[PDB]
PDB file of C-alpha atoms and ligand atoms in Angstrom:
ATOM      1  CA  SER A  29      33.131 199.599 101.665  1.00  0.00           C
ATOM      2  CA  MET A  30      30.175 195.887 102.062  1.00  0.00           C
ATOM      3  CA  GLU A  31      32.611 194.010 100.606  1.00  0.00           C
ATOM      4  CA  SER A  32      35.009 195.997 103.620  1.00  0.00           C
ATOM      5  CA  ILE A  33      32.737 195.031 106.295  1.00  0.00           C
ATOM      6  CA  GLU A  34      32.218 191.611 106.135  1.00  0.00           C
ATOM      7  CA  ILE A  35      35.491 190.646 104.889  1.00  0.00           C
ATOM      8  CA  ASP A  36      36.588 191.748 108.228  1.00  0.00           C
ATOM      9  CA  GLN A  37      33.320 191.138 110.242  1.00  0.00           C
ATOM     10  CA  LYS A  38      34.627 187.497 108.634  1.00  0.00           C
ATOM     11  CA  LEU A  39      38.043 188.030 109.419  1.00  0.00           C
ATOM     12  CA  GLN A  40      36.912 188.847 113.662  1.00  0.00           C
ATOM     13  CA  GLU A  41      34.570 185.596 113.569  1.00  0.00           C
ATOM     14  CA  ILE A  42      37.089 183.283 113.330  1.00  0.00           C
ATOM     15  CA  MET A  43      39.729 185.809 114.626  1.00  0.00           C
ATOM     16  CA  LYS A  44      38.017 184.835 117.894  1.00  0.00           C
ATOM     17  CA  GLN A  45      38.388 181.335 117.315  1.00  0.00           C
ATOM     18  CA  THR A  46      42.209 181.041 116.934  1.00  0.00           C
ATOM     19  CA  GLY A  47      45.357 179.827 119.067  1.00  0.00           C
ATOM     20  CA  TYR A  48      43.978 176.058 118.292  1.00  0.00           C
ATOM     21  CA  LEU A  49      43.552 172.812 116.455  1.00  0.00           C
ATOM     22  CA  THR A  50      40.653 170.557 117.183  1.00  0.00           C
ATOM     23  CA  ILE A  51      41.735 167.077 116.165  1.00  0.00           C
ATOM     24  CA  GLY A  52      40.966 162.934 116.576  1.00  0.00           C
ATOM     25  CA  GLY A  53      38.175 164.928 119.867  1.00  0.00           C
ATOM     26  CA  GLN A  54      40.469 166.552 121.368  1.00  0.00           C
ATOM     27  CA  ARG A  55      41.561 170.522 121.430  1.00  0.00           C
ATOM     28  CA  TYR A  56      45.043 172.186 121.764  1.00  0.00           C
ATOM     29  CA  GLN A  57      46.808 175.150 121.762  1.00  0.00           C
ATOM     30  CA  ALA A  58      48.944 175.535 119.115  1.00  0.00           C
ATOM     31  CA  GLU A  59      51.817 178.021 117.183  1.00  0.00           C
ATOM     32  CA  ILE A  60      54.185 177.234 114.537  1.00  0.00           C
ATOM     33  CA  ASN A  61      56.653 175.690 116.666  1.00  0.00           C
ATOM     34  CA  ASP A  62      54.260 173.117 116.963  1.00  0.00           C
ATOM     35  CA  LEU A  63      54.596 171.574 113.383  1.00  0.00           C
ATOM     36  CA  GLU A  64      57.502 169.928 111.710  1.00  0.00           C
ATOM     37  CA  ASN A  65      57.892 171.832 107.878  1.00  0.00           C
ATOM     38  CA  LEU A  66      58.171 168.359 105.052  1.00  0.00           C
ATOM     39  CA  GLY A  67      57.589 170.853 102.646  1.00  0.00           C
ATOM     40  CA  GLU A  68      55.294 172.404  99.848  1.00  0.00           C
ATOM     41  CA  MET A  69      53.039 171.532  97.420  1.00  0.00           C
ATOM     42  CA  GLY A  70      52.478 172.714  94.329  1.00  0.00           C
ATOM     43  CA  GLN A  76      50.674 178.494  99.639  1.00  0.00           C
ATOM     44  CA  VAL A  77      50.525 174.911 100.760  1.00  0.00           C
ATOM     45  CA  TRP A  78      53.105 173.073 102.834  1.00  0.00           C
ATOM     46  CA  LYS A  79      52.506 169.259 104.321  1.00  0.00           C
ATOM     47  CA  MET A  80      52.798 169.649 108.086  1.00  0.00           C
ATOM     48  CA  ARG A  81      53.165 167.302 111.022  1.00  0.00           C
ATOM     49  CA  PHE A  82      52.204 168.277 114.195  1.00  0.00           C
ATOM     50  CA  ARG A  83      53.932 167.889 116.982  1.00  0.00           C
ATOM     51  CA  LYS A  84      51.900 167.036 120.065  1.00  0.00           C
ATOM     52  CA  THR A  85      49.529 164.109 117.912  1.00  0.00           C
ATOM     53  CA  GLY A  86      51.909 163.065 115.590  1.00  0.00           C
ATOM     54  CA  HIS A  87      49.090 164.385 111.995  1.00  0.00           C
ATOM     55  CA  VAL A  88      50.037 165.176 108.681  1.00  0.00           C
ATOM     56  CA  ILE A  89      47.585 168.306 108.078  1.00  0.00           C
ATOM     57  CA  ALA A  90      48.517 170.700 104.784  1.00  0.00           C
ATOM     58  CA  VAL A  91      48.842 174.695 105.887  1.00  0.00           C
ATOM     59  CA  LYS A  92      47.526 177.361 104.574  1.00  0.00           C
ATOM     60  CA  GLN A  93      49.513 180.533 104.696  1.00  0.00           C
ATOM     61  CA  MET A  94      47.909 184.361 104.912  1.00  0.00           C
ATOM     62  CA  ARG A  95      50.720 186.784 104.297  1.00  0.00           C
ATOM     63  CA  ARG A  96      49.486 190.454 106.303  1.00  0.00           C
ATOM     64  CA  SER A  97      51.619 191.900 103.300  1.00  0.00           C
ATOM     65  CA  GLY A  98      50.494 189.504 100.795  1.00  0.00           C
ATOM     66  CA  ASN A  99      47.679 189.843  97.423  1.00  0.00           C
ATOM     67  CA  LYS A 100      45.073 191.024  98.416  1.00  0.00           C
ATOM     68  CA  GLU A 101      42.695 189.464  95.729  1.00  0.00           C
ATOM     69  CA  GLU A 102      44.610 186.340  96.582  1.00  0.00           C
ATOM     70  CA  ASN A 103      44.113 186.140 100.513  1.00  0.00           C
ATOM     71  CA  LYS A 104      39.998 187.660  99.663  1.00  0.00           C
ATOM     72  CA  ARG A 105      40.143 183.802  97.620  1.00  0.00           C
ATOM     73  CA  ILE A 106      41.570 182.843 100.615  1.00  0.00           C
ATOM     74  CA  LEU A 107      38.760 184.256 103.738  1.00  0.00           C
ATOM     75  CA  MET A 108      36.180 182.954 101.480  1.00  0.00           C
ATOM     76  CA  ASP A 109      37.376 179.305 100.648  1.00  0.00           C
ATOM     77  CA  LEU A 110      38.314 179.562 104.970  1.00  0.00           C
ATOM     78  CA  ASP A 111      34.400 181.178 105.077  1.00  0.00           C
ATOM     79  CA  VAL A 112      32.896 178.126 103.861  1.00  0.00           C
ATOM     80  CA  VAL A 113      34.689 175.064 104.905  1.00  0.00           C
ATOM     81  CA  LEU A 114      34.049 176.462 108.639  1.00  0.00           C
ATOM     82  CA  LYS A 115      30.297 177.025 107.559  1.00  0.00           C
ATOM     83  CA  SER A 116      30.272 172.773 105.515  1.00  0.00           C
ATOM     84  CA  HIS A 117      31.996 171.368 108.799  1.00  0.00           C
ATOM     85  CA  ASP A 118      28.904 168.946 109.166  1.00  0.00           C
ATOM     86  CA  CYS A 119      28.619 167.511 105.332  1.00  0.00           C
ATOM     87  CA  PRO A 120      30.621 165.172 105.585  1.00  0.00           C
ATOM     88  CA  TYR A 121      31.823 165.235 100.902  1.00  0.00           C
ATOM     89  CA  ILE A 122      34.316 168.755 101.872  1.00  0.00           C
ATOM     90  CA  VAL A 123      37.621 168.821 102.969  1.00  0.00           C
ATOM     91  CA  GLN A 124      37.583 169.590 107.004  1.00  0.00           C
ATOM     92  CA  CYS A 125      39.457 172.680 108.451  1.00  0.00           C
ATOM     93  CA  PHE A 126      40.776 172.305 112.171  1.00  0.00           C
ATOM     94  CA  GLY A 127      41.769 175.359 113.211  1.00  0.00           C
ATOM     95  CA  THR A 128      43.641 179.319 112.245  1.00  0.00           C
ATOM     96  CA  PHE A 129      46.673 180.561 114.550  1.00  0.00           C
ATOM     97  CA  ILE A 130      48.553 184.143 113.785  1.00  0.00           C
ATOM     98  CA  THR A 131      51.241 185.283 114.483  1.00  0.00           C
ATOM     99  CA  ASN A 132      52.578 189.288 114.173  1.00  0.00           C
ATOM    100  CA  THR A 133      52.605 189.140 110.183  1.00  0.00           C
ATOM    101  CA  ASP A 134      50.800 185.744 108.560  1.00  0.00           C
ATOM    102  CA  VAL A 135      46.965 184.202 110.311  1.00  0.00           C
ATOM    103  CA  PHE A 136      48.208 179.906 108.661  1.00  0.00           C
ATOM    104  CA  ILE A 137      45.151 177.301 107.735  1.00  0.00           C
ATOM    105  CA  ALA A 138      45.681 173.579 109.844  1.00  0.00           C
ATOM    106  CA  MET A 139      42.957 171.594 106.360  1.00  0.00           C
ATOM    107  CA  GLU A 140      42.948 167.404 106.401  1.00  0.00           C
ATOM    108  CA  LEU A 141      45.976 166.598 104.287  1.00  0.00           C
ATOM    109  CA  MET A 142      43.961 163.861 101.446  1.00  0.00           C
ATOM    110  CA  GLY A 143      46.425 161.625  99.889  1.00  0.00           C
ATOM    111  CA  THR A 144      45.519 163.286  96.209  1.00  0.00           C
ATOM    112  CA  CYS A 145      43.131 164.584  94.233  1.00  0.00           C
ATOM    113  CA  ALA A 146      41.694 163.270  90.937  1.00  0.00           C
ATOM    114  CA  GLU A 147      43.381 164.932  87.628  1.00  0.00           C
ATOM    115  CA  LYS A 148      46.914 163.402  89.860  1.00  0.00           C
ATOM    116  CA  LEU A 149      45.691 159.827  89.722  1.00  0.00           C
ATOM    117  CA  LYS A 150      44.348 160.144  85.809  1.00  0.00           C
ATOM    118  CA  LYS A 151      48.183 160.491  85.181  1.00  0.00           C
ATOM    119  CA  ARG A 152      48.850 158.023  87.852  1.00  0.00           C
ATOM    120  CA  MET A 153      46.735 155.512  85.850  1.00  0.00           C
ATOM    121  CA  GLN A 154      48.119 156.483  82.430  1.00  0.00           C
ATOM    122  CA  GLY A 155      44.102 155.760  81.233  1.00  0.00           C
ATOM    123  CA  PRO A 156      41.159 155.181  82.614  1.00  0.00           C
ATOM    124  CA  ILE A 157      39.821 155.541  86.549  1.00  0.00           C
ATOM    125  CA  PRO A 158      36.943 152.536  87.045  1.00  0.00           C
ATOM    126  CA  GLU A 159      33.328 153.046  87.064  1.00  0.00           C
ATOM    127  CA  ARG A 160      33.165 151.642  90.398  1.00  0.00           C
ATOM    128  CA  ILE A 161      35.319 154.566  91.930  1.00  0.00           C
ATOM    129  CA  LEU A 162      33.755 157.385  89.654  1.00  0.00           C
ATOM    130  CA  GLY A 163      30.177 156.436  90.679  1.00  0.00           C
ATOM    131  CA  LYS A 164      31.482 156.811  94.174  1.00  0.00           C
ATOM    132  CA  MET A 165      33.358 160.175  93.329  1.00  0.00           C
ATOM    133  CA  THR A 166      29.665 161.216  91.254  1.00  0.00           C
ATOM    134  CA  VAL A 167      27.626 161.008  94.406  1.00  0.00           C
ATOM    135  CA  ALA A 168      30.398 162.094  96.538  1.00  0.00           C
ATOM    136  CA  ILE A 169      31.213 165.509  94.551  1.00  0.00           C
ATOM    137  CA  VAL A 170      27.234 165.915  93.326  1.00  0.00           C
ATOM    138  CA  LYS A 171      26.470 166.253  96.854  1.00  0.00           C
ATOM    139  CA  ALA A 172      28.785 168.824  98.041  1.00  0.00           C
ATOM    140  CA  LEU A 173      27.603 171.062  95.110  1.00  0.00           C
ATOM    141  CA  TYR A 174      23.991 170.513  96.437  1.00  0.00           C
ATOM    142  CA  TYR A 175      24.614 170.956  99.678  1.00  0.00           C
ATOM    143  CA  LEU A 176      27.146 173.815  98.552  1.00  0.00           C
ATOM    144  CA  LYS A 177      23.655 175.694  96.840  1.00  0.00           C
ATOM    145  CA  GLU A 178      21.456 174.695  98.706  1.00  0.00           C
ATOM    146  CA  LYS A 179      21.649 175.105 102.693  1.00  0.00           C
ATOM    147  CA  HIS A 180      24.406 178.403 101.993  1.00  0.00           C
ATOM    148  CA  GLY A 181      23.289 179.488  98.387  1.00  0.00           C
ATOM    149  CA  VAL A 182      26.756 178.967  97.015  1.00  0.00           C
ATOM    150  CA  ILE A 183      28.408 178.389  93.319  1.00  0.00           C
ATOM    151  CA  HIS A 184      31.597 176.362  93.150  1.00  0.00           C
ATOM    152  CA  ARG A 185      32.677 177.764  90.107  1.00  0.00           C
ATOM    153  CA  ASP A 186      36.016 175.479  89.501  1.00  0.00           C
ATOM    154  CA  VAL A 187      34.200 171.328  89.238  1.00  0.00           C
ATOM    155  CA  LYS A 188      37.118 169.408  88.264  1.00  0.00           C
ATOM    156  CA  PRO A 189      39.788 166.451  89.354  1.00  0.00           C
ATOM    157  CA  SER A 190      42.695 168.960  90.059  1.00  0.00           C
ATOM    158  CA  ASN A 191      39.081 169.605  92.922  1.00  0.00           C
ATOM    159  CA  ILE A 192      37.828 166.372  94.100  1.00  0.00           C
ATOM    160  CA  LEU A 193      40.377 164.594  96.490  1.00  0.00           C
ATOM    161  CA  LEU A 194      40.821 161.174  97.744  1.00  0.00           C
ATOM    162  CA  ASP A 195      42.774 159.309 100.375  1.00  0.00           C
ATOM    163  CA  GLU A 196      43.630 155.625 101.755  1.00  0.00           C
ATOM    164  CA  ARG A 197      40.146 156.160 104.171  1.00  0.00           C
ATOM    165  CA  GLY A 198      38.550 155.443 100.827  1.00  0.00           C
ATOM    166  CA  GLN A 199      36.976 159.319 101.847  1.00  0.00           C
ATOM    167  CA  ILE A 200      36.284 161.367  98.368  1.00  0.00           C
ATOM    168  CA  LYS A 201      35.948 165.634  99.391  1.00  0.00           C
ATOM    169  CA  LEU A 202      35.006 168.967  97.337  1.00  0.00           C
ATOM    170  CA  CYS A 203      37.444 171.198  97.374  1.00  0.00           C
ATOM    171  CA  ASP A 204      39.004 174.600  97.387  1.00  0.00           C
ATOM    172  CA  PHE A 205      35.907 176.495  97.405  1.00  0.00           C
ATOM    173  CA  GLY A 206      38.932 180.297  96.464  1.00  0.00           C
ATOM    174  CA  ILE A 207      36.964 181.102  93.982  1.00  0.00           C
ATOM    175  CA  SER A 208      33.286 179.860  94.902  1.00  0.00           C
ATOM    176  CA  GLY A 209      30.515 183.117  94.840  1.00  0.00           C
ATOM    177  CA  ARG A 210      26.651 183.591  96.676  1.00  0.00           C
ATOM    178  CA  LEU A 211      24.636 183.624  94.814  1.00  0.00           C
ATOM    179  CA  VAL A 212      21.485 186.237  94.008  1.00  0.00           C
ATOM    180  CA  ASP A 213      18.673 184.673  93.233  1.00  0.00           C
ATOM    181  CA  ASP A 214      19.510 181.909  92.299  1.00  0.00           C
ATOM    182  CA  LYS A 215      21.888 183.697  89.969  1.00  0.00           C
ATOM    183  CA  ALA A 216      26.074 184.326  89.130  1.00  0.00           C
ATOM    184  CA  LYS A 217      26.959 187.473  87.622  1.00  0.00           C
ATOM    185  CA  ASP A 218      31.509 186.723  88.020  1.00  0.00           C
ATOM    186  CA  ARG A 219      32.322 185.936  84.126  1.00  0.00           C
ATOM    187  CA  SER A 220      36.153 185.184  84.753  1.00  0.00           C
ATOM    188  CA  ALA A 221      35.624 183.095  88.025  1.00  0.00           C
ATOM    189  CA  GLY A 222      37.078 179.193  86.439  1.00  0.00           C
ATOM    190  CA  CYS A 223      39.555 177.622  84.178  1.00  0.00           C
ATOM    191  CA  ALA A 224      37.560 177.953  80.391  1.00  0.00           C
ATOM    192  CA  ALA A 225      38.575 174.357  79.922  1.00  0.00           C
ATOM    193  CA  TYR A 226      36.240 172.910  81.983  1.00  0.00           C
ATOM    194  CA  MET A 227      33.285 176.499  80.953  1.00  0.00           C
ATOM    195  CA  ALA A 228      29.654 175.615  80.085  1.00  0.00           C
ATOM    196  CA  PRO A 229      28.035 176.852  76.721  1.00  0.00           C
ATOM    197  CA  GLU A 230      26.048 179.539  78.117  1.00  0.00           C
ATOM    198  CA  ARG A 231      28.965 180.672  79.718  1.00  0.00           C
ATOM    199  CA  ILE A 232      31.501 180.556  77.508  1.00  0.00           C
ATOM    200  CA  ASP A 233      28.433 182.764  75.550  1.00  0.00           C
ATOM    201  CA  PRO A 234      24.958 184.116  76.392  1.00  0.00           C
ATOM    202  CA  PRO A 235      22.494 183.339  74.934  1.00  0.00           C
ATOM    203  CA  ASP A 236      20.452 186.388  75.529  1.00  0.00           C
ATOM    204  CA  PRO A 237      23.131 189.175  75.726  1.00  0.00           C
ATOM    205  CA  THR A 238      20.740 191.651  78.232  1.00  0.00           C
ATOM    206  CA  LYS A 239      20.985 188.710  81.425  1.00  0.00           C
ATOM    207  CA  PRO A 240      24.412 187.276  81.277  1.00  0.00           C
ATOM    208  CA  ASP A 241      24.651 184.872  84.175  1.00  0.00           C
ATOM    209  CA  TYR A 242      24.481 182.111  85.200  1.00  0.00           C
ATOM    210  CA  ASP A 243      23.424 179.148  88.393  1.00  0.00           C
ATOM    211  CA  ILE A 244      24.604 175.861  88.956  1.00  0.00           C
ATOM    212  CA  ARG A 245      23.818 174.498  85.682  1.00  0.00           C
ATOM    213  CA  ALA A 246      26.968 176.046  84.667  1.00  0.00           C
ATOM    214  CA  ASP A 247      29.132 173.234  87.224  1.00  0.00           C
ATOM    215  CA  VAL A 248      27.308 169.769  86.256  1.00  0.00           C
ATOM    216  CA  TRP A 249      28.920 170.416  82.965  1.00  0.00           C
ATOM    217  CA  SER A 250      31.850 170.937  84.916  1.00  0.00           C
ATOM    218  CA  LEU A 251      31.072 168.231  86.392  1.00  0.00           C
ATOM    219  CA  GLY A 252      30.030 166.190  82.916  1.00  0.00           C
ATOM    220  CA  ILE A 253      33.461 166.850  81.232  1.00  0.00           C
ATOM    221  CA  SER A 254      35.892 165.408  84.240  1.00  0.00           C
ATOM    222  CA  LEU A 255      33.779 162.727  84.703  1.00  0.00           C
ATOM    223  CA  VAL A 256      34.478 161.976  80.416  1.00  0.00           C
ATOM    224  CA  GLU A 257      37.583 163.094  80.577  1.00  0.00           C
ATOM    225  CA  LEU A 258      38.475 160.158  84.066  1.00  0.00           C
ATOM    226  CA  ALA A 259      36.381 157.807  82.519  1.00  0.00           C
ATOM    227  CA  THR A 260      38.372 157.867  79.512  1.00  0.00           C
ATOM    228  CA  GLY A 261      42.028 158.617  81.044  1.00  0.00           C
ATOM    229  CA  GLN A 262      41.604 161.377  78.543  1.00  0.00           C
ATOM    230  CA  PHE A 263      40.800 165.396  78.323  1.00  0.00           C
ATOM    231  CA  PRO A 264      37.398 165.334  75.966  1.00  0.00           C
ATOM    232  CA  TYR A 265      39.334 168.106  73.953  1.00  0.00           C
ATOM    233  CA  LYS A 266      42.911 167.735  74.503  1.00  0.00           C
ATOM    234  CA  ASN A 267      44.182 168.296  70.976  1.00  0.00           C
ATOM    235  CA  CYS A 268      43.097 170.855  70.489  1.00  0.00           C
ATOM    236  CA  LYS A 269      46.034 173.391  69.972  1.00  0.00           C
ATOM    237  CA  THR A 270      45.151 176.586  72.557  1.00  0.00           C
ATOM    238  CA  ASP A 271      42.360 177.424  74.633  1.00  0.00           C
ATOM    239  CA  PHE A 272      40.661 179.755  72.014  1.00  0.00           C
ATOM    240  CA  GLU A 273      40.163 176.410  69.751  1.00  0.00           C
ATOM    241  CA  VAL A 274      38.212 174.392  73.138  1.00  0.00           C
ATOM    242  CA  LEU A 275      35.709 176.597  73.238  1.00  0.00           C
ATOM    243  CA  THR A 276      34.799 177.352  69.513  1.00  0.00           C
ATOM    244  CA  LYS A 277      34.303 173.529  69.514  1.00  0.00           C
ATOM    245  CA  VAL A 278      32.227 173.702  73.124  1.00  0.00           C
ATOM    246  CA  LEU A 279      29.748 176.349  71.457  1.00  0.00           C
ATOM    247  CA  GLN A 280      29.586 174.538  67.783  1.00  0.00           C
ATOM    248  CA  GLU A 281      30.003 170.868  67.441  1.00  0.00           C
ATOM    249  CA  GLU A 282      28.166 168.139  69.615  1.00  0.00           C
ATOM    250  CA  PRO A 283      28.937 167.716  73.012  1.00  0.00           C
ATOM    251  CA  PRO A 284      31.184 164.945  74.104  1.00  0.00           C
ATOM    252  CA  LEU A 285      29.727 161.530  75.812  1.00  0.00           C
ATOM    253  CA  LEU A 286      31.421 158.813  77.070  1.00  0.00           C
ATOM    254  CA  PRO A 287      32.604 156.668  73.856  1.00  0.00           C
ATOM    255  CA  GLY A 288      30.065 153.084  73.513  1.00  0.00           C
ATOM    256  CA  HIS A 289      32.484 151.275  72.269  1.00  0.00           C
ATOM    257  CA  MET A 290      34.322 150.549  76.316  1.00  0.00           C
ATOM    258  CA  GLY A 291      30.874 149.259  77.284  1.00  0.00           C
ATOM    259  CA  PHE A 292      30.007 151.243  79.773  1.00  0.00           C
ATOM    260  CA  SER A 293      27.500 151.263  81.574  1.00  0.00           C
ATOM    261  CA  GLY A 294      23.861 152.890  80.955  1.00  0.00           C
ATOM    262  CA  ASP A 295      22.909 154.193  83.823  1.00  0.00           C
ATOM    263  CA  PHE A 296      26.345 155.984  83.599  1.00  0.00           C
ATOM    264  CA  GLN A 297      26.532 157.081  79.801  1.00  0.00           C
ATOM    265  CA  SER A 298      22.531 158.462  80.345  1.00  0.00           C
ATOM    266  CA  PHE A 299      24.070 160.805  83.968  1.00  0.00           C
ATOM    267  CA  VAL A 300      27.194 162.269  81.747  1.00  0.00           C
ATOM    268  CA  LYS A 301      25.266 162.393  78.734  1.00  0.00           C
ATOM    269  CA  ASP A 302      22.309 164.479  81.027  1.00  0.00           C
ATOM    270  CA  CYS A 303      25.606 167.132  82.971  1.00  0.00           C
ATOM    271  CA  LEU A 304      26.752 167.613  79.725  1.00  0.00           C
ATOM    272  CA  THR A 305      23.093 168.763  77.511  1.00  0.00           C
ATOM    273  CA  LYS A 306      24.146 171.824  75.759  1.00  0.00           C
ATOM    274  CA  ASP A 307      21.134 174.224  75.970  1.00  0.00           C
ATOM    275  CA  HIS A 308      20.586 174.800  79.881  1.00  0.00           C
ATOM    276  CA  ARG A 309      17.440 174.950  80.135  1.00  0.00           C
ATOM    277  CA  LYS A 310      17.156 171.578  79.937  1.00  0.00           C
ATOM    278  CA  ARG A 311      20.022 170.864  82.261  1.00  0.00           C
ATOM    279  CA  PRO A 312      19.462 168.651  85.450  1.00  0.00           C
ATOM    280  CA  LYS A 313      20.145 170.747  88.663  1.00  0.00           C
ATOM    281  CA  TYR A 314      21.294 169.072  91.030  1.00  0.00           C
ATOM    282  CA  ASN A 315      18.236 167.871  92.300  1.00  0.00           C
ATOM    283  CA  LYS A 316      17.624 166.218  89.437  1.00  0.00           C
ATOM    284  CA  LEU A 317      20.489 164.865  89.122  1.00  0.00           C
ATOM    285  CA  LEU A 318      20.399 163.001  92.991  1.00  0.00           C
ATOM    286  CA  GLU A 319      17.137 160.915  91.032  1.00  0.00           C
ATOM    287  CA  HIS A 320      19.881 159.478  88.979  1.00  0.00           C
ATOM    288  CA  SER A 321      19.502 156.092  88.913  1.00  0.00           C
ATOM    289  CA  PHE A 322      23.149 155.688  88.402  1.00  0.00           C
ATOM    290  CA  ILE A 323      23.187 157.784  92.386  1.00  0.00           C
ATOM    291  CA  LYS A 324      20.779 155.792  92.792  1.00  0.00           C
ATOM    292  CA  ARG A 325      22.959 152.628  92.304  1.00  0.00           C
ATOM    293  CA  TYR A 326      26.186 153.998  93.923  1.00  0.00           C
ATOM    294  CA  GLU A 327      24.605 155.240  97.113  1.00  0.00           C
ATOM    295  CA  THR A 328      23.793 152.003  98.084  1.00  0.00           C
ATOM    296  CA  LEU A 329      27.104 150.126  96.827  1.00  0.00           C
ATOM    297  CA  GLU A 330      30.023 148.685  98.875  1.00  0.00           C
ATOM    298  CA  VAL A 331      32.603 150.069  97.063  1.00  0.00           C
ATOM    299  CA  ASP A 332      36.236 149.410  98.694  1.00  0.00           C
ATOM    300  CA  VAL A 333      37.748 152.406  97.553  1.00  0.00           C
ATOM    301  CA  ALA A 334      40.609 152.706 100.053  1.00  0.00           C
ATOM    302  CA  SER A 335      41.773 149.781  98.646  1.00  0.00           C
ATOM    303  CA  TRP A 336      41.420 151.223  95.066  1.00  0.00           C
ATOM    304  CA  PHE A 337      43.656 154.194  96.240  1.00  0.00           C
ATOM    305  CA  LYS A 338      45.708 152.208  98.094  1.00  0.00           C
ATOM    306  CA  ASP A 339      47.028 149.927  94.870  1.00  0.00           C
ATOM    307  CA  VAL A 340      46.978 152.322  92.775  1.00  0.00           C
ATOM    308  CA  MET A 341      49.646 155.220  95.486  1.00  0.00           C
ATOM    309  CA  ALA A 342      51.280 151.579  95.624  1.00  0.00           C
ATOM    310  CA  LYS A 343      51.704 150.932  92.327  1.00  0.00           C
ATOM    311  CA  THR A 344      52.788 154.183  91.025  1.00  0.00           C
ATOM    312  CA  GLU A 345      55.410 156.735  90.647  1.00  0.00           C
ATOM    313  CA  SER A 346      54.565 160.514  91.507  1.00  0.00           C
ATOM    314  CA  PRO A 347      53.684 161.909  88.217  1.00  0.00           C
TER     315      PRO A 347
HETATM  316 NA1   NA B 401      33.253 168.945 106.166  1.00  0.00          NA
END
């Protein structure tokens, strides 16, 4: 099975570099006992590496665990390692093994955009969202252009922030390799952020979708974070949400709040219903919203720290 060969092939490549953490410009030999457990994050554990004091995120892959779940963890790990040089994607410090487990050390961030939304109990400021848009669109473009990967789960819980003001994309466990710029897997992703063409393919003989589906998910995420509410929150079921995505006009930023013209334009472009007219990432990167925020000095770090200091855990 070519699925079996590449999975063991990738596993071998990773096992060759196991037994050490590269953190702070130094390579350290590493075992489970070198790591103090500090509790789960709803398996992903927050752990202190005793040799340096760094607090990290630790994923646990079981030998006797769910086969589909271990495939996702290996897929996520593979994409993370390949994406080392992209600064908008979380970093892995290394792996180490027991007889029964593979532990994976990841960069601990502060929190996700979904949790920030809950802490804010309202909007995240346009200036933060502008930096976020730049970062996430560059991460997704990087995955597409350099690895032929479609993320398939762009949503606020996968956008991370830290106290240094970095914004990064994470969780590629359901990411797919594109074939001729197309993906086939119709079950991969969260229903609420699905584009119209993924819910109901316009051509039932050619049902496959591409990165433009993720562009829609980005748009929905931006409206959600900019207003403090998921646009279809008052739908009583997932089936109702999807029915509205199909039948109604797309959500927009509401004009009465005074969002800048270029942000309104960007969201409106991302939320073009007809996927043939929806821009790809290379076109989004030319958008004046992005150009404005690429160069703009925004103190995301101070804003982040202030929010985390002033609010309770959701
Ligand atoms: Na990276």
